[PDB]
Write a protein that binds this ligand. Structure first.
Ligand SMILES: NC(=O)c1ccc[n+]([C@@H]2O[C@H](COP(=O)([O-])OP(=O)(O)OC[C@H]3O[C@@H](n4cnc5c(N)ncnc54)[C@H](O)[C@@H]3O)[C@@H](O)[C@H]2O)c1
Ligand SMILES: NC(=O)c1ccc[n+]([C@@H]2O[C@H](COP(=O)([O-])OP(=O)(O)OC[C@H]3O[C@@H](n4cnc5c(N)ncnc54)[C@H](O)[C@@H]3O)[C@@H](O)[C@H]2O)c1
Ligand SMILES: NC(=O)c1ccc[n+]([C@@H]2O[C@H](COP(=O)([O-])OP(=O)(O)OC[C@H]3O[C@@H](n4cnc5c(N)ncnc54)[C@H](O)[C@@H]3O)[C@@H](O)[C@H]2O)c1
Ligand SMILES: NC(=O)c1ccc[n+]([C@@H]2O[C@H](COP(=O)([O-])OP(=O)(O)OC[C@H]3O[C@@H](n4cnc5c(N)ncnc54)[C@H](O)[C@@H]3O)[C@@H](O)[C@H]2O)c1
Ligand SMILES: [Mg+2]
Ligand SMILES: [Zn+2]
Lengths: 467, 255, 276, 255, 255, 255
RNA sequence: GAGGUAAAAUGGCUGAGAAGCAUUGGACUGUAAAUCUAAAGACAGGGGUUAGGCCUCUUUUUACCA
């Protein structure tokens, strides 16, 4: 139906459509479809009137919640207020979807301070969603109340919730009206949050940031939409983006938190035996730092059409000719002769490189990580493994992001796809894509609305702002 | 060998008696199935050929057993072996304190009257019959084999009267052997354990499996054919007298 | 109060929540850290209610709808026979150990499920013709497993024909005779040895940190073995870890001179496509 | 100790029963002599003292035993011990080939009814009576002591019916011991040999002396006081149950 | 009465022997605790009183038992009763097909020597000193009570050697009674069930609890004082000879 | 049937064992006489034929029995039945007061060893031998048939050691049957009375004729061929296990 | 004896998208205890989420890349 119906119309429609209705009741099914297709609130109001007439003025809570959804979607504030009064009268407490819809509808009206009370009522049993906070913040900003908006933002961050970018965009969009130092500093705090947590503004959010910066008094910001050259310099000004290498303090804490967690996670027998830990550690401290750290079993197993020792020898020799100092991690079973492995090629490897063989039941990858980290920043490792599992077994998210940054900076992956072709590694970027400051200058990546991305690759466009 | 002998089996129309009659007729001996009129003795006798006959009778009745022995004389002119297998079983607890229930004297008396008293009646009348036989080389006139149970030795809850009957047979086995030793008749007793007869095969499958698992070895219920085998072995051994043999597979009945 | 009204308003909207809730489980709900945990616990309560009321309805439906040798006392006789065989096993039975050292690596859900599987394993062992002699090693008296076992068995716990010890299986038996069964073992179990003590980890593994049993077996040098599931079955779905009762049934079938196909009949059929 | 115990001695007017009653009364217990009207038990009950009462009763009947037990309950209020010592003896051979004489079925029936069926009747009614007693510190409600004979094991020529009845008692001793275990009643049997009572002395005096000489040691007939001593021993020992004790001086009968 | 008698209890420093010695010394008799030097015989003998003396001896050894009897004669001047309560138990199956284990012959011979040969050594050496006694009224010079077990009638799995030794004791009970009847010594055997003594320490506690629960009545392990009571009852009954008494509470063991 | 079976008969050169070997070899079976080197079993093994072999062995020694079983396995490849008939007899009184004579521990030890310990040794080695057999339908691997006189039950004056050994065999018959039930080995025991063999005929001849007159029926002493008949019957009956059969013609011995 | 990618996961077993067969503690059961009673019921494990849907990260399994 597309037009309001009469009671007899509703009854004959019920008689006809009870066939399709199936398990649930007719009225709930019909209002569900109306909400699905966004019917006008007059049709739904007629349906509710018919139901109430049939039921002595009692309309079930589910129907009333779906009607609230319809009359909130169509931006009808008056019926939202009336439904709010009905809810208050008939029930003493509501359901979180009811509370959420009421908050989403009441932010627009003059009775917008009650949405904060509804949020507090939700807080009793469950943590409010990100969207409840978003709606409350927008309602507070539309009515020139910024203290409550920042209080709600700070509560959101207090519950360890990642704010939806719409809320931050709202702060930046509203910032234009105000000319105050405190608000500007809080917006810069939001930018620093973006930087810390590796979040990229949307295209509209990027434009909002650009406009806010350009609107500052006294200092004439200039904004541009640019890209970063392969040498790590953005086209807008030529300044160099930040380096992908980790900071010394961060590098030290990452060494510590990999040793103490990924290798000896309070057991020291799961991955490897204590004897192997001590032996490997002594071996590492014996040899001066290395330049490459190869994973023998990963590079040997690439092409199933070649013997494992053959591939290992090819890769090791090709890396050796470059004058790099190598280190070939592996397993003891690699030494014992087999069809796959032959002593001649392994002896060529141990003359070209400096190998370390663990127990066949031990895990190689943590040894790779610690050897590379112990060597220093200049060191790199050759492996196609993405090491998702080792990154998983890290204490918190910040450490995992540090690990991911270091892995990008220092991992070499064989893109080569046939044994005959020459050895080539996937490109390693020299710069990190992240919201960053250089005193006055601000460089901010962003995502293009009409594109799609993956968590693997990182935004290409940039926003460059100069004081 | 049993070839040519004449056997009188009580309860010969079912279970152990029928198995004994089957084996003995198969080996060449004539058989008389002394059993109740209401049983299926006539059909079994027809199945076994002309060497087997059926005699309606009640072991508790003297006239019935006398008529059966007269029929045996008329048909075959002699009685050489007797096998007492006719009996009933009754399960009833002596006293139940929780239920306030006491054993009924009529149950005890009917169990006694069938098992022990019919066994003795058959023994005495068939001894009178065998006395008319001329001694065989070795001085033997006949053999009497009674059936008993391991309840005579270890009896389960509810088997007071059945245990009393079986223990009475076991107790009187030797006195009668000594009584009839001058006449030249041997008396033996067999104590089956758990056998696959209509007493047991009618029970649920679960309880049958449990009972089979109770026997140490073989872990199965006995087969009447090998009860008949033991009976024939007793008939063929002149020096087995006044003894009880337990054909139970090493099972000692649980409380 | 307020919570008991939120839960009713969720019930009205067709959400999966219990119709009736009690104070202790309300406290449990409030002890759930996050929203997802609360939703999961509420769904668990809802399904418990559904199953309880379904079985009660079936109870109401069921309520509405000579010469003998033995008295019908069969269940008691079966129990007593099982007890006699259990005593004989205690004396001359082969040891089978259940390591109870995983209480730290288990949350309440999987701890309770472990107790259930232990109960079923012991039940299956009792019924067997040649039962093992069972050990509960590393079972701490004040632990959670001990409390749950003394709550499930009740006053039969002290009348159970098995050895419960607060010591380790490396102290009760020779180290070289112990074989520790784990799906992660590189070595495979070709045949069932009758002179070896087999150790089964009482552990429902729902952690994302794998190879805990292997770490336990390495810390104390012990032999390890795994069932030859891959060799004998066309595995399609499910993890190789089997429930404790399936493990004990397989070991019992192998113990009583059973081939590998008959033994592996107890592997769930949903997990493999067929036999090879 | 037996002090304060109430005992019901069946056949307590004479023989082993009278000796048991004398000993128990002397030790401080109370006795009911359950016996036949013409047994002469009234004089003996007067002789023993005020703690001994005489109940006329024929064990073969429910009514008589019930009246006797009601009398015991009324007089003393409890029944703690029962001693089955009533019985009869019959001498007759199963078959006389020389004399052409066969055992009588009525003799077998009456011997079985008195020795075996009456014992069960007394046991079951007395178990019903004892079930009402409060459990003692050990949980015991009473003790039942049946009398059997060594004829249950090595019977003699002419003792087919006596051996049958006594073997029935010995066979049913254990089933009843298991039946009454939950209640707390202990059931035991004594199998004496050649005691100096009227039953034995009714044999030819020369046979009496010869049998007295046959006993290995003491080479004499038993003293009913020794039977009473063993009965008291069984009463005072908590751990004797479901067992047969041979009080016969190591004698084994000959054919 | 046992007042003034002299008793030699073998294995009297523990368990059943110690209980018998305690009861006899409490009833006024004198006691000789014949036992190994390794046992705590000295402390028990000092505790019992002046009427108890400890004899370090090995029943398997002729010289040791002779020295112990010499000590008993020297201290108390005679020997009136001899209790054989010295023995050991083993738990080993005859053959184990799964484990490929066979019963050790040294285990069998050790159990057979301690239980069966030591009992006979004591019996034959004590009959000599009993013969020196002047016959009492009735002609009795002494009493010998041996301790068999219920494993002599239904032994359990892994109880072959123990059952063999106890069956040997039960078997020789009567021949020795007939041997010693001419000189007036009574030979008796007691076959206890499950008793609470150090001998049961080998079994697991839960197995002991199950077995105790499996006794019909009383449903507990036997008390050594009850064995002592039965021993005293046998000592005071002149007419108990050549019989085995089962003090087991009606328990029949299962595999 | 017994055709194709391999039977190891201990003491098969003389008497009952020799009769068993003759009967089994005449029924199509194979025999391995297991006897002392001086007995003269070579001649009898030659007489029987190519289905009989002789093995010099002393059942008291483990190595000799192991070598004999190895010889049996090599000759026939399999062991199916084991008939334990070896034994010795001694006639000495426990104590003689008039003569001042005491039983020697050496005679007791020798008889005990040879009869009981040797029987156990053979049983435990032959059980391991039979464990190698593949179970037939019914799950049977082997049969063990021990001999143990009626002296186990009633022993005459001067049979203390013989009674002890045979009582030990009878006592351990059931424990071993329960032990070997899982393997599928049936353990049975025969208890012969008086039989015509060197053992019996050794003692004064007119005493033997008196003893023969004492057998109720047949009066003549037992015939070893009839022992062989009963052994064959036990081999052919799947459900005979853990029982003692008396083959004595109903004779009960006297002091 | 290493990886990448995509579909899958019922912790007693089958299912349906409901339900049956089992499991644990009690009941000395008069032969439908073929019962009666209590106990245990989380569709891999964590976080989120729509008007209704379903996404996401780990672990494991399978099949491809080969
Ligand atoms: N499992 C066993 O079969 C088993 C175990 C122990 C003892 N027993 C004893 O073995 C004997 C036979 O057992 P069964 O299984 O063959 O029995 P059954 O019940 O199969 O025997 C039925 C037969 O008994 C006959 N019968 C019964 N009472 C009779 C009477 N008063 N007069 C004449 N005929 C009478 C019937 O006419 C019928 O032919 C019985 O004494 C039984 O108690 C058997
Ligand atoms: N030599 C022995 O004394 C000897 C040997 C073996 C067994 N027994 C048994 O010992 C028990 C005691 O016998 P006894 O030595 O006193 O001999 P007894 O001849 O003196 O016994 C006679 C007693 O039996 C009673 N009696 C008989 N039938 C009765 C009935 N139907 N109802 C009630 N009372 C009845 C009489 O009234 C009298 O009290 C009997 O069971 C007997 O068979 C005795
Ligand atoms: N449950 C039971 O205790 C039980 C059951 C059945 C039979 N029995 C028999 O009862 C007897 C005693 O039982 P218990 O519980 O008192 O035993 P126990 O183990 O307590 O007896 C220990 C005593 O035996 C003595 N002893 C052992 N071997 C000896 C030897 N060769 N020479 C001298 N002294 C020796 C020790 O020195 C010690 O004093 C034994 O024959 C036993 O088999 C006991
Ligand atoms: N009248 C009887 O024959 C009779 C009665 C009862 C029991 N038994 C038992 O029957 C069995 C055999 O009776 P039998 O008449 O054949 O006796 P027997 O005396 O004729 O048997 C002699 C045989 O025993 C063998 N033998 C003895 N000790 C031996 C040893 N240590 N190792 C190996 N072989 C040994 C001899 O070499 C010879 O072959 C014995 O156990 C006997 O006690 C026999
Ligand atoms: Mg990896
Ligand atoms: Zn720039």
């Amino acid at each position: 139906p597309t037009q309001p119906l009469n009671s007899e119309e509703w009854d004959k429609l019920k008689e006809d459509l009870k066939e399709n209705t199936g398990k649930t009741s007719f009225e709930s099914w019909i209002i569900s479809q109306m909400a699905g297709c966004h019917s006008s609130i007059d049709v739904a109001k007629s349906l509710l009137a018919w139901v109430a007439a049939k039921n002595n003025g009692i309309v079930s809570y589910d129907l009333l919640v779906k009607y609230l959804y319809l009359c909130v979607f169509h931006m009808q504030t008056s019926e939202v207020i009336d439904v709010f009064e009905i809810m208050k009268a008939r029930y003493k407490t509501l359901e979180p979807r009811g509370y959420s819809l009421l908050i989403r509808g009441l932010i627009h009206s003059d009775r917008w301070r009650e949405a904060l009370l509804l949020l507090e009522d939700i807080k009793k049993v469950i943590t409010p969603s990100k969207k409840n906070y978003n709606d409350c913040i927008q309602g507070a900003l539309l009515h020139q109340d910024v203290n409550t908006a920042w209080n709600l933002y700070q509560e959101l961050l207090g519950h360890d919730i990642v704010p939806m970018l719409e809320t931050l965009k709202a702060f930046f969009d509203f910032g234009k009206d105000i000319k105050d130092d405190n608000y500007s500093n809080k917006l810069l705090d939001i930018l620093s949050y973006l930087r810390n947590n590796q979040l990229y503004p949307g295209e509209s959010f990027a434009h909002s940031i650009k406009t806010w910066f350009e609107s500052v008094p006294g200092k004439q910001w200039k904004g541009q939409f640019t890209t970063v050259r392969k040498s790590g310099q953005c086209s807008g000004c030529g300044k160099t983006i930040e380096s992908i290498q980790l900071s010394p303090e961060e590098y030290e804490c990452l060494k510590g938190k990999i040793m103490r967690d990924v290798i000896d996670g309070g057991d020291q027998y799961r991955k490897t035996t204590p004897q192997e830990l001590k032996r490997f550690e002594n071996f590492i401290k014996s040899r001066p730092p290395f330049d490459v750290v190869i994973d023998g079993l990963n590079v040997a197993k690439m092409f199933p059409k070649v013997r494992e020792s053959q591939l290992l020898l090819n890769v090791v020799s090709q890396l050796a000719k470059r004058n790099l100092r190598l280190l070939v991690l592996g397993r003891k079973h690699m030494l014992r002769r087999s069809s796959q492995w032959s002593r001649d090629e392994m002896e060529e490897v141990q003359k070209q490189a400096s190998c370390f063989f663990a127990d066949d039941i031990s895990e190689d990858d943590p040894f790779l990580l610690y050897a590379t980290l112990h060597s220093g920043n200049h060191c790199r490792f050759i492996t196609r493994d993405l090491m998702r599992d080792h990154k998983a077994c890290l204490p918190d998210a910040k450490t995992q992001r540090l690990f991911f940054k270091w892995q990008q900076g220092h991992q070499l992956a064989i893109v080569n796809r046939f044994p005959g072709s020459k050895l080539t590694f996937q490109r390693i970027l020299s710069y990190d894509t992240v919201v960053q400051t250089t005193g006055d200058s601000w460089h901010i990546p962003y995502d293009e609305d009409l594109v799609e991305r993956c968590s693997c690759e990182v935004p290409t466009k940039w926003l460059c702002l100069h004081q | 060998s049993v070839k040519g002998l004449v056997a009188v089996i009580t309860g010969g129309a079912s279970g152990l008696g029928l198995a004994t009659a089957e084996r003995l007729v198969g080996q060449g001996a004539s058989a008389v199935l002394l059993d109740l009129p209401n049983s299926g003795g006539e059909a079994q006798a027809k199945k076994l050929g002309n060497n087997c006959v059926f005699a309606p009778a009640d072991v508790t009745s003297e006239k019935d057993v006398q008529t059966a022995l007269a029929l045996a004389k008329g048909k075959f002119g002699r009685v050489d072996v007797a096998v007492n297998c006719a009996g009933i079983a009754v399960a009833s607890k002596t006293y139940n304190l929780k239920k306030g229930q006491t054993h009924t004297l009529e149950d005890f008396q009917r169990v006694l009257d069938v098992n022990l008293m019919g066994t003795f009646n058959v023994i005495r009348l068939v001894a009178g019959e065998m006395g008319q036989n001329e001694p065989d080389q070795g001085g033997q006139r006949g053999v009497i084999i009674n059936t008993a149970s391991v309840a005579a030795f270890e009896g389960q809850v509810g088997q007071a009267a059945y245990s009393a009957s079986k223990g009475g047979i076991v107790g009187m086995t030797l006195p009668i052997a000594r009584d009839l030793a001058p006449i030249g008749i041997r008396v033996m007793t067999i104590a089956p354990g758990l056998f696959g007869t209509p007493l047991l095969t009618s029970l649920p499958e679960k309880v049958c499996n449990f009972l089979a698992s109770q026997v140490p070895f073989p872990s199965r219920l006995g087969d009447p054919a090998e009860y008949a085998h033991l009976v024939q072995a007793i008939i063929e051994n002149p020096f087995l007298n006044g003894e009880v043999i337990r054909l139970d597979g090493a099972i000692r009945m649980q409380p | 109060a307020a919570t008991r009204e939120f839960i009713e308003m969720w019930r009205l909207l067709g959400r999966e929540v219990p119709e009736h809730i009690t104070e202790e489980e309300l406290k449990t709900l409030m002890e759930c850290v996050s929203n997802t945990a609360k939703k999961k616990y509420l769904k668990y309560l809802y399904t418990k209610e559904k199953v309880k009321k379904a079985r009660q309805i079936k109870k109401e439906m069921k309520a509405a709808a000579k010469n003998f040798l033995f008295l019908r006392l069969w269940d008691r006789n079966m129990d007593i026979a099982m007890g006699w065989k259990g005593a004989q096993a205690m004396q001359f039975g082969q040891p089978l150990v259940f390591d109870m050292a995983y209480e730290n690596y288990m949350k309440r859900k999987e701890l309770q499920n472990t107790v259930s599987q232990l109960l079923e394993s012991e039940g299956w062992n009792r019924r067997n013709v040649d039962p093992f002699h069972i050990y509960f090693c590393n079972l701490k008296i004040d632990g959670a497993l001990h409390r749950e076992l003394v709550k499930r068995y009740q006053e039969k716990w002290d009348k159970l024909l098995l050895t419960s010890t607060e010591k380790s299986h490396v102290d009760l038996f020779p180290k070289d005779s112990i074989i520790y069964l784990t799906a992660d073992s590189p070595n495979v179990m070709t045949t069932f040895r009758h002179d070896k003590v087999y150790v089964i980890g009482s552990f429902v593994d729902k952690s994302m940190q794998p190879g805990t049993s292997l770490a336990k077996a390495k810390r104390l040098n012990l032999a390890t073995e795994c069932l030859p599931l891959d060799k004998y079955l066309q595995w399609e779905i499910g993890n190789k870890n089997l429930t404790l009762d399936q493990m004990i049934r397989i070991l019992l079938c192998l113990k009583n001179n059973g081939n590998w196909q008959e033994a592996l009949q107890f592997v769930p059929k949903r997990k493999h496509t067929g036999f090879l």
